[PDB]
Design a protein around this ligand. Structure first.
Ligand SMILES: [Cu+2]
Ligand SMILES: [Mg+2]
Ligand SMILES: [Zn+2]
Lengths: 308, 248, 143, 392, 307, 267
C-alpha cells in the first residue's frame, strides 16, 4: 500500500515543461522530503498531490484514488508556508471553523489546541499572535480528523528550539500509527534526523530518491573518520595509504582517516577488531553536503569562496 | 451544507471589522439626522434617505468584500481552503451569504433607528404606509448592497495584490455612484438633439444605483421589471465572479 | 407629429394668462410641441413665452394666424402659417388681446399695407426681442 | 318689460323716495326717474328668467335692500341683474341679494357708481364659461365697489379699462378668477378676500395701480397673476396655500417691468414666486417667503438683487446667522442653485434628481463659486418676520 | 575585546527582563545567542546595538560607547524580517544605505555582485522574494567594512545553496577579524559554524562557551544510530532491557543512546554479531544541549506529543 | 549632512507613488479648469476663493497620502529598527522625512498653480501681470504651508499608532475633521444659536483650523462678493493683521512638529 503514487507525470504550463518525468512512490509510514532550489519542481509537485492542479501528461494516485475526491481530502492534512489566518477571528474559533469544513468532531478542537500548546493563547485574536504561534495553529488544522497524509511545507519556521523538536516528536508518534507524511523544508540540517528518504530534485527532473544510507553510498562524498584511543600509533597509522586513503596522522593520541565511503566505515570488524578502539567519534557528511553535490550533478556551477 | 459553515465565519469576521462598524454607526446616525430634519423642519424624507443609502450601501459592500478572494490569497488560506472538501463555487457563494447578511443587518440598524425617529417624531405619520414604504425600502437597499457585494467579488478575483484591489474598488464606487450619472447629465447640457430624450429612461437600467432610486419613487417602464432588473444585476455579476474565481 | 397645427375651440384657455382665447380679436399664436399642444391668447403673449430660456432649446413648431387672408375681429383657424417665416407689423392702433398688437402676415406687402395705414414698421421674427415687446406695449396701452 | 313705477311703492318721504313692501313680483323692471327706492326684507323681485331684471337709466338712484332672483342668461345681449346705463351717473346699489345665471352688476360708461354690501350668488351647474361676471365694470371713472360677497360667478369682479376706483373689503368665493383687471390704469383695491379660486388676482395690462392688503385663501394654481403691469405697488398681500388644480404659484410675475413688491406674505404654496426672464429690475424687498417648497423660480443667468435700501426679505429656509444685532442677516441668500435650474431647463433631469451626483453638485457650488450662475440672490436678508400683523 | 557586556541587569516596568549577564566576546570569535521564553535574546541584542539604555551596568562595544557614531559605522545589523521600500529598486535601496553609513559608492556595485543579486538589481523590491530581501538585507550589513556583524536569523526563507554560501562568507569574515553574533532559532545547522554558544533563558545567562565546553559541563551520552540491521525487534528488546532508550525509525533502522561507558561494549554487538550496513555515532548536539540547559533551570519537559 | 541623505530617498520614493501622481495631476487639471471658467465668465474674486477651496480639499489630501505611513510604515516594515543602528538620531529621521516629503508638496503645487497661471496669462487678454504674479505668488508660498501643516499632522498620527491599517483610519479622520467637519460644526453652531452664542469668541475659532487660516490669507485682497465666503465671513471680525495670519500658520507647523518629535522620541 502506497499513499502517493506519482506515476510518470509531466507538468507543463505553455510550451515550457516545469516538471519533467517525475516518478515517486511514498510508502505507508515513511517521511518523504522534497527539496528544490531552482525550478518549481518542489512547488508544482506539492500542487499535484493536492487537488490544486491537474496532471497534464500523467496521473497521481493519492491514497489509491483521484487527488480531488472528497473522501481523500477528509483524511489529508496540509500546512502551507507563511499562512496568515483571519486576524479578527480567534484562535479557538479558527479551528472550530476548520473542524466544520473537514467534518471532524468538535471534541478534537479542545484537544488539539492543548496538543500543540495553544491553551494559554486560545480565545485571543490571531492578529496578536507571533510567527511561531501561528505555526502551532497551522499545524493544528492539519491534525484535524484522522489524517492519513500530511504535507508540511516549511513546518518549523519561527518556532522555538524546544517546540521544533517536539513537533518532530509529534511526527514520529504519527508515523508509528501509520500516517505517512511529506516534509518540504529549506533548512536541511534539522530535518535530516527525522526524514525517512530524501527526494532531492533539480530544476526539471528528479535527481535522486532514497534513504540517507543510499544517498551517501551512491553519491561519492567524503567522509571524515576521525579516531582517538590509538593502539601503538605507528603501524596502525601508516597502513591507510596503501589501502587507498590519505590519513592525516595526528600525534596527540588521535588518528584521522579520510576515506571514499566504499570502504565504508568500520568495514566488517577491521577498524575495531584490533581490541583497543577507546572512544572513537564519527562525523559523517550531512544532508546539506549531499544537496550541493546533486546541484553540481545537473548544471549549477559552484560559487566562489564567499559570495552568497 | 458547507456553504453555511463558511458563511458563519464571514459573519463573525465581518462583525468584528472596526472599519465596517464605524461606517455602520455613521450610517445610522445620518439616517436619524436626516429623519430629525425631515420631521421637525414621509415621501419627502424617503427620497433624501434614498440618496443617503446610495452613498453608503455601495461603500459598506465594497468595504466588506474587496479583500474577500485576494485577501485570502495574500493570507495564504485560499490555497489551504481549496484542499478541503470544498468547491470553488461554495467558497464564493458562502462568502456571498455571509457578507450578504451583514449589510442585511446594517439596514436593520440603519433604518430600524431611522423609522423609530419617524414613528416617534411626527405624531400622526399614518404608520400603515410606513411599514410598506420602509419594507420596500429595506429590501431594495439590501439588493443594492448585494450588487456591489457581487461587484467586489469580481474585482477581488481579478487582481493579485490587496493594495490594487482597493484601488479598483474605489474606482468601481466612483464610476457606479457619481460618474455614470454625471455623464448622463453631461450629454444633455452639451447638446440637445445629439441624444434622444426618450432613450435616457432605458439607459438608467445600466446602473444599479439608478434602478435603486426608481423603486423608491413609486416612467415608461413598469415597477416589476426594475425588481427583475436589479436581481439580474446580482445574477450576472455573481456568475461573472464565479467565472473569474475558476481562473486563478 | 409636430407638423400639424390643431384648431381652436371656444373652451381653449391661454397657456400664460389662462383666459378664454376666442373672446378676443387679433391673431392667436399656438405652439405644437409633439408631446402636447399649448395655445396662446395673443401673438405677443406667445412671443413673450418663446423668448424665455426654458423654450429656446425646446423643439416645438410655432404657428400664428395669417391676417393677410382673414378679418381681424374673427380669424379663422384655416390658413395658419409658420411663425418663424412671418412678417409681423408693430405699433398699430389695433386692440389685441394681451400684449402689443402684432398682426402676423405672410406676403410682406400686406404687412407693408398695414404699416403705412397705421404708422408702423414691419419686422421679422428674429428681430423680435424682449426689449421690443415691452417697448411696443408701453406705447400702445400707456399715456 | 315693465317699469318700477308699474309696481306699488309706498312713499316714506316726498323727495322721489319710495319703499317697496314685502311680497314677490314678476318680470323685468326699468328705472327711468331718480328714485331712492328702499325695500322691505320680503321684497323678492323675481323675474321669469329672461332679460335684464333691474335696468337703470336715470342718474342719482339709491337702490337699497332689494332681492333679485332668476334673470336672463344671454351674455351677448348682457342679461344682467342690475344694468346701469352710461347716463345713470352716481348710482348706489346697496345691500342686495342676487341669484341668477347672468351678470350680477353690469355697469358701463358710468361715473361714481357705488356697489356696496351686496350678496351675489351666481350659479351651480354652468361650466364657469357662461356664468357671467359678478360685478362687471366697463370703463368707469370714479366707482366705489365696497364690501360685497360674490359667490360662484364667472371671473369675479371683471374690470375693463376703468380708471379710478376702489375695491374695498369684498369676499369672493368659488369662482374662476377672483378679481380680473383689463387695462385699468391708476386703479386701487384694498383688503379683499379671495377663497378657492382658479386664479386669485388677474392683473392684466393695468398700470399705475395699488394692490394692498388682499388675502388669498387656498386658491388654485395662481395666487396673484400679473401680466404687463407697470409702476404698480404690491404692499401687504397675504397669499396662502396655492394648491394645484400650473403647479401652484403664489405670485406669477410676467412682463411686469417697474413695481414695488413689499411686505407680502407668500405661504405654503408649491412655488413662492415665479419671475419670468422679461420681468426684471423691480423693487422686491420685505416679503416673507415662508413654507413654500420652492421659493423663487428664475430661469436666467442675469443677476437680480432683491434688496432695496439694504433691507431684504425673510426666507424660511435661510440658514444664516446675525452677529451684529440688527434685523438683517449676515450672509447673502441665493434661492436657486445651478442644478435647480437644470431641472427647469431640461425636464428629463427629474429622473436624476435624487442621485448622489446631484447632491454632490449642490455641494460643489457651495465650495467652488465659479460655477455658480448669477441668480436671484439678495444681500442682507431679514432674520425675523416683517409681516407680524398679516397672520391674524 | 569586541563586545564587553559587564554586569548588565536591564529592567523596565520594575520587571527585570534581563539579569546579571557577563558576556565578553572575543575579536575573532563567532557567538550564538539562543533564547526561548525570556526576552534576553531580544533585549541584549538591542543593548549591543545601542538603541537601548543599559540600566544598572555598562555595555562597551569595540572598547567604546555603544551609541557613538564612530562605532555605528563599524557595525552591521541584519534584522528579523525587512521588506525595505517596495517602490525603490535594488541599487537605489543599497545606495541609500551607502550614504547613511558613510561608505564609499564603490562598494555598492561590488556588493550586489558579491551577493547574488546583480541579475535582480535595478528591479523593484515588490518583485523580490523573501530570499532576495534576505540577500539584500545582508548587502547592507557588509557595507563599509564592519568590525561587528550582528545577524538576526539570516537564513529564513533562503534556498540551501545560498544558505551554505552565507556561512562560507561568514567564515571569510571571521578570518578577516570581524566578530559575528548569530542570533537564531534554527539551532541544528548553525552549530557547525559558531565558535561559542550562549544559551540564555529566563533572563539569567545559563551557559556560555564552545561546544566542547558545553558537553564538558553537562554529562550527556553519545547517540549511536545504526541502519541496515537484520531485524528491528531483535535488537530493540535488548537495549531497552540494558537501560538505554531506543526507538525505531524505519523498516530496518534504529538509534541507540549510550552512557559513554557502555558505547564500546554495545558497539562490539554491532559488528561481530548481525552485521549492518551503516553506523553513525553522534555527539550531543546543540539541539540536545538546548533542552538540557532549559530543563536544568526553570522549564519542565512536556509530554510525548504535547507541543 | 544626514538630513539631506535621507531626504533624497523620500524625494525618490514619493515620486514613484502612483497614487500621488494621480492626485497631483488632478490638482493640475482642476486648477486649470477653475481658471478657465473664471476666464470665460469675464469673476476675479470668485476664482480666488475657489482655487483656495481646491487646495483645501487636495493639499491636505496629498500631504496625508504621503506621510501617514512615514513612521509606522517603516516600523512594521522592519526598516525603522535597522535605521536607528545607523549613525543617525531620531531628530534627523523625522526632519529628513519632513524635508523630503515637503519638497514634493512644494513641487506638487508649483505644478498646479504654475499651470493655473499659464491658463490665465495666455487666456484672459490684458490681465495685470503684477497682480497675477503677486496673487499666485501668495498662493504658492501658502499652499505649501497648508501642506506642511498636514504633513506634520501625519507624523503625529504615525508615531502614535502601531499598525499601518489603523494609521489610514486616523489620517482619514484628520482629513475629514479639519477640512469639512470643522467648517460644518462652526456653521451649525452659528445656525442653531442664530449668531447669539458669543459675538466675540466665535471669530477666534477660525484660528483653531489651519484650513481656515489658509483661506483667510488668500482672501485678503479679493473679498468681492459676500456669499462666496459663507462661514469665512467672520474673518472681517478678526482684529489680527495679515502678518499674524502667516504666523499662526507657521505656529501650526512648529507645535505639531515638536509634538511629532516628542511622540517619536518615546516610540
Ligand atoms: Cu384678462
Ligand atoms: Mg449685520
Ligand atoms: Zn393668453
Amino acid at each position: 500500500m502506497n499513499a502517493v503514487e506519482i506515476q510518470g507525470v509531466s507538468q507543463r504550463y505553455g510550451s515550457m515543461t516545469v516538471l519533467h518525468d517525475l516518478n515517486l512512490n511514498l510508502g505507508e509510514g515513511e517521511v518523504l522530503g522534497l527539496f528544490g532550489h531552482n525550478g518549481a519542481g518542489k512547488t508544482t509537485s506539492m500542487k499535484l498531490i493536492l487537488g490544486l492542479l491537474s496532471p497534464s501528461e500523467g496521473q497521481v494516485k493519492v491514497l489509491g484514488r483521484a487527488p480531488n475526491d472528497p473522501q481523500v481530502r477528509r483524511q489529508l492534512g496540509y500546512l502551507p508556508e507563511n499562512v496568515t489566518f483571519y486576524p479578527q477571528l480567534s484562535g479557538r474559533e479558527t479551528l472550530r471553523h476548520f473542524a466544520r469544513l473537514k467534518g471532524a468532531a468538535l471534541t478534537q478542537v479542545d484537544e488539539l489546541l492543548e496538543q500543540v500548546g495553544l491553551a494559554h493563547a486560545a480565545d485571543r485574536r490571531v492578529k496578536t499572535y507571533s510567527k511561531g504561534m501561528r505555526q502551532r495553529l497551522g499545524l493544528a488544522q492539519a491534525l484535524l480528523g484522522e489524517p492519513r497524509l500530511l504535507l508540511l511545507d516549511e513546518p518549523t519556521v519561527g518556532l522555538d528550539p524546544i517546540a521544533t523538536q517536539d513537533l518532530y516528536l509529534l511526527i514520529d508518534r504519527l508515523r508509528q500509527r501509520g500516517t505517512s507524511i511529506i516534509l518540504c523544508s529549506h533548512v536541511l540540517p534539522g530535518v535530516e534526523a527525522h526524514i525517512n528518504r530524501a527526494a532531492i530534485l533539480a530544476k526539471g527532473c528528479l535527481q535522486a530518491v532514497g534513504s540517507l544510507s543510499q544517498l551517501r553510498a551512491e553519491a561519492g562524498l567524503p567522509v571524515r573518520i576521525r579516531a582517538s584511543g590509538i593502539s601503538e600509533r605507528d603501524s596502525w597509522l601508516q597502513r591507510w595509504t596503501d589501502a587507498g586513503h590519505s590519513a592525516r596522522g595526528l600525534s596527540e593520541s588521535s588518528i584521522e582517516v579520510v576515506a571514499v565511503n566504499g570502504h565504508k566505515l568500520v568495514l566488517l570488524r577491521q577498524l575495531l577488531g584490533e581490541g583497543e578502539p577507546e572512544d572513537i567519534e564519527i562525523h559523517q557528511p550531512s544532508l546539506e553536503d549531499l544537496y550541493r553535490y546533486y546541484m553540481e550533478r545537473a548544471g549549477d556551477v559552484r560559487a566562489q569562496e564567499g559570495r552568497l | 451544507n458547507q456553504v453555511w459553515n463558511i458563511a458563519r465565519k464571514e459573519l463573525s469576521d465581518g462583525l468584528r471589522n472596526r472599519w465596517l462598524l464605524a461606517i455602520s454607526l455613521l450610517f445610522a446616525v445620518l439616517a436619524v439626522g436626516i429623519a430629525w430634519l425631515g420631521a421637525a423642519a414621509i415621501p419627502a424624507t424617503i427620497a433624501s434617505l434614498a440618496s443617503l443609502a446610495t452613498f453608503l450601501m455601495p461603500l459598506i459592500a465594497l468595504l466588506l468584500a474587496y479583500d474577500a478572494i485576494v485577501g485570502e490569497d495574500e493570507g495564504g488560506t485560499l490555497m489551504l481552503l481549496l484542499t478541503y472538501p470544498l468547491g470553488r463555487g461554495q467558497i464564493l457563494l458562502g462568502k456571498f451569504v455571509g457578507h450578504g447578511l451583514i449589510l442585511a443587518l446594517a439596514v436593520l440598524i440603519g433604518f430600524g433607528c431611522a423609522a423609530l425617529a419617524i414613528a416617534l417624531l411626527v405624531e400622526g405619520v399614518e404608520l400603515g404606509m410606513l411599514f410598506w414604504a420602509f419594507g420596500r425600502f429595506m429590501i431594495s437597499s439590501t439588493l443594492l448592497g448585494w450588487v456591489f457585494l457581487a461587484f467586489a467579488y469580481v474585482l477581488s478575483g481579478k487582481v493579485n495584490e490587496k493594495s490594487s484591489a482597493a484601488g479598483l474598488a474605489l474606482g468601481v464606487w466612483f464610476l457606479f455612484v457619481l460618474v455614470f450619472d454625471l455623464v448622463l447629465l453631461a450629454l444633455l447640457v452639451l447638446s440637445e438633439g445629439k441624444f434622444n430624450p426618450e432613450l435616457l429612461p432605458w439607459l438608467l437600467l445600466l446602473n444599479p444605483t439608478d434602478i435603486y432610486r426608481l423603486i423608491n419613487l413609486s416612467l415608461p417602464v413598469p415597477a416589476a421589471v426594475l425588481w427583475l432588473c436589479l436581481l439580474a444585476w446580482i445574477g450576472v455579476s455573481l456568475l461573472l465572479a464565479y467565472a473569474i474565481f475558476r481562473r486563478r | 407629429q409636430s407638423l400639424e397645427p390643431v384648431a381652436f375651440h371656444d373652451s381653449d384657455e391661454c397657456h400664460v394668462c389662462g383666459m378664454i382665447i376666442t373672446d378676443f380679436p387679433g391673431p392667436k399664436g399656438q405652439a405644437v410641441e409633439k408631446r402636447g399642444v399649448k395655445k396662446f391668447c395673443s401673438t405677443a403673449e406667445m412671443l413673450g413665452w418663446w423668448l424665455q430660456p426654458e423654450n429656446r432649446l425646446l423643439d416645438a413648431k410655432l404657428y400664428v394666424h395669417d391676417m393677410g387672408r382673414s378679418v381681424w375681429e374673427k380669424p379663422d383657424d384655416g390658413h395658419l402659417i409658420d411663425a418663424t417665416s412671418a412678417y409681423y407689423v408693430v405699433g398699430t392702433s389695433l386692440k389685441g388681446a394681451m400684449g402689443a398688437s402684432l398682426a402676423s402676415f405672410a406676403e410682406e406687402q400686406d404687412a407693408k399695407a398695414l404699416a403705412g395705414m397705421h404708422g408702423g414698421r414691419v419686422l421679422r421674427f428674429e428681430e423680435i426681442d424682449q426689449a421690443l415687446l415691452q417697448e411696443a406695449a408701453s406705447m400702445q396701452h400707456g399715456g | 318689460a315693465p317699469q318700477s313705477i308699474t309696481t306699488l311703492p309706498l312713499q316714506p318721504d316726498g323727495e322721489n323716495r319710495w319703499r317697496l313692501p314685502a311680497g314677490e313680483y314678476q318680470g323685468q323692471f326699468t328705472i327711468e326717474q331718480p328714485m331712492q327706492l328702499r325695500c322691505e326684507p320680503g321684497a323678492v323681485i323675481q323675474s321669469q328668467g329672461q332679460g335684464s331684471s333691474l335696468l337703470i337709466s336715470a342718474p342719482d338712484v339709491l337702490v337699497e335692500g332689494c332681492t333679485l332672483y332668476e334673470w336672463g342668461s344671454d351674455l351677448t345681449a348682457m342679461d344682467s341683474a342690475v344694468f346701469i346705463l352710461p347716463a345713470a351717473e352716481r348710482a348706489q346699489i346697496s345691500n342686495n341679494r342676487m341669484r341668477g345665471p347672468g351678470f350680477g352688476v353690469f355697469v358701463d360708461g358710468t361715473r361714481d357708481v357705488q356697489v356696496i354690501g351686496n350678496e351675489i350668488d351666481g350659479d351651480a351647474g354652468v361650466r364657469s364659461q357662461d356664468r357671467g361676471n359678478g360685478i362687471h365694470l366697463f370703463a368707469v371713472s370714479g366707482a366705489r365697489v365696497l364690501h360685497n360677497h360674490v359667490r360662484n360667478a364667472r371671473d369675479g369682479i371683471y374690470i375693463d379699462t376703468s380708471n379710478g376706483n376702489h375695491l374695498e373689503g369684498n369676499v369672493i368665493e368659488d369662482v374662476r378668477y377672483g378679481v380680473h383687471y383689463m387695462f385699468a390704469n391708476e386703479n386701487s383695491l384694498i383688503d379683499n378676500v379671495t377663497r378657492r379660486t382658479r386664479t386669485g388676482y388677474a392683473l392684466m395690462q393695468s398700470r399705475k395701480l395699488t394692490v394692498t392688503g388682499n388675502r388669498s385663501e387656498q386658491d388654485q394654481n395662481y395666487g396673484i397673476l400679473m401680466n404687463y403691469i407697470t409702476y404698480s405697488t404690491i404692499t401687504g398681500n397675504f397669499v396662502s396655500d396655492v394648491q394645484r388644480g400650473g403647479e401652484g404659484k403664489a405670485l406669477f410675475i410676467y412682463n411686469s417691468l417697474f413695481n414695488t413688491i413689499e411686505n407680502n406674505h407668500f405661504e405654503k404654496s408649491s412655488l413662492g414666486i415665479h419671475l419670468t426672464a422679461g420681468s426684471e429690475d423691480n423693487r422686491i424687498s420685505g416679503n416673507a417667503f415662508v413654507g413654500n417648497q420652492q421659493q423663487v423660480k428664475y430661469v436666467a443667468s442675469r443677476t437680480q438683487e432683491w434688496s432695496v435700501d439694504g433691507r431684504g426679505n425673510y426666507w424660511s429656509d435661510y440658514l444664516g446667522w446675525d452677529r451684529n444685532n440688527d434685523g438683517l442677516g449676515d450672509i447673502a441668500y441665493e434661492p436657486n442653485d445651478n442644478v435647480d435650474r437644470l431641472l427647469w431647463l431640461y425636464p428629463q433631469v427629474r429622473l436624476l434628481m435624487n442621485s448622489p451626483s446631484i447632491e454632490v453638485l449642490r455641494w460643489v457650488q457651495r465650495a467652488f463659486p465659479v460655477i455658480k450662475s448669477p441668480g436671484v440672490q439678495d444681500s442682507h436678508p431679514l432674520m425675523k418676520l416683517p409681516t407680524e400683523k398679516l397672520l391674524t
